[PDB]
Amino acid sequence: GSSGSSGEQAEAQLAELDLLASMFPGENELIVNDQLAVAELKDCIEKKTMEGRSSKVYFTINMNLDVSDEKMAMFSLACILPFKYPAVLPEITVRSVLLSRSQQTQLNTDLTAFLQKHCHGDVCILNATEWVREHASGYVSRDTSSSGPSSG
Description:
alpha+beta; Ubiquitin Conjugating Enzyme; 4-stranded antiparallel β-sheet; 39% helix; elongated
């Protein structure tokens, strides 16, 4: 007895992407540079030949959150879906002028771990964005206001 549709892997990825798009109705919330990738993932399923996908699904996610000094900033999350997912977790790389080379590094290294533990062997790209907005803000360190006002 045949179950579901062949090449479930391809459908496992596309499905999510299609959903995310909705999760972010905003105009400047999520932007995908490598659109062709998706197209191949949609056709590969129909043709059921799994012979085309030559580029990885690259798409950045802009999330507006606060870090410090009652200020806000944009957080770019370069998410990349490999040809294994859910097999192997994506290569989500968070970047933001706010975070420095050192910090940013540690941050990312963590963002990945989160899933490796919580989300392992499944299609959950959101679970991450949620773990970031929380940690991210923390990582960002801004000190432009000291205590003890001086008069005169």
